[PDB]
Ligand binder design. Structure first.
Ligand SMILES: CCn1ncc2c1-c1cnc(N)c(c1)O[C@H](C)c1cc(F)ccc1-c1nn(C)nc1C2
Ligand SMILES: CCn1ncc2c1-c1cnc(N)c(c1)O[C@H](C)c1cc(F)ccc1-c1nn(C)nc1C2
Lengths: 275, 275
């Protein structure tokens, strides 16, 4: 099994909008990636004259995304690796990163958020499925957070899907074992997924708002956890709580996480119609 | 121009669920109404041995709905008029009446409503279009209220459309001219449409909650109007306010009502993305 990245003619690609740094990241268009015609894409670059190691890391990303193939995992459409800068062509997620999407939903009107409980639960289900896939592909993400997911649509009415991307100490997302001992397992991923669904349920609040970065470890290692989101469904709080069991093997599996979420959703939908 | 109602073989129709009285109203299935196969329908009946006049009114309804043809006006799929009871076959609106749909959205979770401002504005746009059509067809509805509209879907995530149906003193929906003088114009319809969009924006609250039916006329004729909904967008309050101008010709047209609504929506959507 010799791996092969999907090559795409550079001539057909046109950069249009700079998004930021991460090389840099651009929005652009690309011809017949998928008859297809002119379709919009995100382009991750590799800065000219970067370290020899930096070029290897960039190619590691590319390989990972070639292997992955799942609705809730970001698709890599092509690569342009013959010239500098190197291009990784990603499907454009018009909703931007999940953290932004959540915040724009909250701070759009005081009349109320543009995302509802059902919308939010569907976001959690999407990621959980993604996490289940990655687990089955023996992959530990080691940076599960809203900032590292993307949303398909800019608006808040159209059907949407979330996908995991991104293949600094994020102390607020890190399991106690990770901080103290540098341990990173699927179970420590479950800790982070816990924090993520808290992010979703609070529409993109900062975890541990009352604590500096230096105070987070202190607070956690005395059994201090996040405060429940406003009106957070009990069933979802019990899931989050168990994601942050101090003992790693006391945390649920991603299969079970997806079970809980779908079951909760089923229950909630039924309660609507029965009223 | 001789009118013709759409006849549908009675044998193919099967009643399944009673919905209530209004004859009575049923949910059921009907074969090849639209290859189509077995599709679900609502059935309005005419009670056996009812007044000769009652049978004429029933047929008046049928004729009206045959003429009307618009996305935001309820479709009549067929009639079974050869036997008793008489059947008017309506397209099934799984969301039920708008008033119910609104209430189930509010009282589903204290976490927050399952309908957002954008969802609600789209409901107003739908009706306004319907009202514009009926006006162009020289029709005065004379009972515009949430109870008389229907929603396409039961859930609160799937794309939805509202439609006008229903072709007792509803004092809370009635213009001052109507109550005092028995006047009913398109402009008095605009009054009611005002009250309707208040119903939508309050998720199905009762107008004038502090007033008995006997007190409503009193309160209105001294210039007393509804209190603004919580956090109601200013632009929408100004529209509602003008719908309830004491002088009938000081009220806006349905064309203008649709203008305001779409413009407001455009503005609001832009403000989202620009943030
Ligand atoms: C609508 C355009 N857009 N606008 C903002 C962003 C994207 C955006 C949309 N589709 C992508 N495939 C995309 C970004 O890819 C990058 C590499 C990305 C991935 C990720 F998981 C998390 C954040 C980013 C990111 N990096 N910057 C600098 N910005 C963004 C979000
Ligand atoms: C999901 C089933 N369903 N459940 C409730 C209702 C409908 C329903 C759905 N689709 C229809 N075409 C339908 C009712 O027609 C009737 C005549 C109707 C029209 C209307 F404008 C306002 C209320 C009603 C009504 N009359 N009852 C007694 N109930 C309802 C609402």
């Amino acid at each position: 099994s010799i791996e092969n990245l999907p090559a795409f003619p550079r001539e057909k690609l046109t950069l249009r909008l700079l998004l930021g740094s991460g090389g840099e990241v651009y929005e652009g268009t690309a011809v017949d990636i998928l008859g297809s015609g002119e379709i919009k894409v995100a382009v991750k670059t590799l800065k000219k004259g970067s370290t020899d190691q930096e070029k290897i890391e960039f190619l590691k990303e590319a390989h990972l995304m070639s292997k992955f193939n799942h609705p809730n995992i970001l698709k890599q459409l092509g690569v342009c690796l013959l010239n500098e800068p190197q291009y990784i062509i990603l499907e454009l997620m018009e909703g931007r990163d999940l953290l932004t999407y959540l915040r724009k939903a909250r701070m759009a009107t005081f009349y109320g958020p543009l995302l509802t409980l059902v919308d939010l639960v569907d976001l959690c289900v999407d990621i959980s499925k993604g996490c289940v896939y990655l687990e089955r592909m023996h992959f530990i993400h080691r940076d599960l957070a809203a900032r590292n997911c993307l949303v398909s649509v800019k608006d808040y009415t159209s059907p949407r899907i979330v996908k995991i991307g991104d293949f600094l100490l994020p102390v607020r997302w890190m399991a106690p074992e990770s901080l103290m001992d540098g341990i990173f397992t699927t179970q420590s991923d479950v800790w982070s997924f816990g924090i993520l669904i808290w992010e979703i349920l609070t529409l993109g609040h900062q975890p541990y708002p009352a604590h500096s970065n230096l105070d987070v470890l202190n607070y956690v290692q005395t059994g201090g956890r996040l405060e429940p989101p406003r009106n957070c469904p009990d069933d979802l709080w019990n899931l989050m709580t168990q994601c942050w069991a101090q003992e790693p093997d006391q945390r649920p599996t991603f299969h079970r996480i997806q079970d809980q979420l779908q079951l909760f959703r089923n229950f909630f939908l039924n309660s609507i119609y029965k009223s």
